Amino acid sequence: QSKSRKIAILGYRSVGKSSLTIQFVEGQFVDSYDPTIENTFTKLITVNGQEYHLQLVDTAGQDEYSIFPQTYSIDINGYILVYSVTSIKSFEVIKVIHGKLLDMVGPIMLVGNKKDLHMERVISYEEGKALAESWNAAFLESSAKENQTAVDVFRRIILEAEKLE
Ligand SMILES: Nc1nc2c(ncn2[C@@H]2O[C@H](COP(=O)(O)OP(=O)(O)O)[C@@H](O)[C@H]2O)c(=O)[nH]1
Ligand SMILES: [Mg+2]
């Protein structure tokens, strides 16, 4: 009866990929986490009464140039593309990442993290929303400081997978 899913969390460095995943997995907000390592977390969750075992591939992070390794496209059932609402460069980069990803595969969602930082925000909600609409993808904003927003992210990619499945 059980169901395994492997999810890759992509984005520019310091957007909060690790912080988000850890919020969800451990239920606590981390400051000290190293941006170099790739890590793979597990979690169990029930979505519409189906129990999933999630493998969450928190990538180191990438930029305009870096080429996709094969762990970014083999055996992946969902992608979470994260930018930070405080970094325009993170937002330009995530459009690049999304382009490369369609070519390197031939269920993706977009998350604008760090929404709690109202004095540093330089990307509007609607910019993110418009972009994901342009990809035909789900969009959420999140704060790694706020558990429900991180839970909502990872739940959402499963919900997205259930339709596209
Ligand atoms: N205020 C705030 N800080 C965050 C958020 N997400 C990540 N951070 C911080 O931003 C820095 C980079 O986070 P990290 O998860 O390492 O980004 P990664 O490099 O994409 O994994 C760390 O100091 C985090 O504590 C958020 O939603 N809100
Ligand atoms: Mg990290």
Author numbering: 3 to 108, 113 to 171
Question: How is this structure described in the published paper?
Answer:
Crystal structures of GDP- and GTP-bound Rheb have been reported, and the switch II domain is typically disordered and adopts different conformations. We obtained a 2.05 Å structure of GDP-bound Rheb and replicated the results reported by Yu et al.. 1 was then soaked into the same crystals, whereupon additional electron density was observed in the switch II domain.
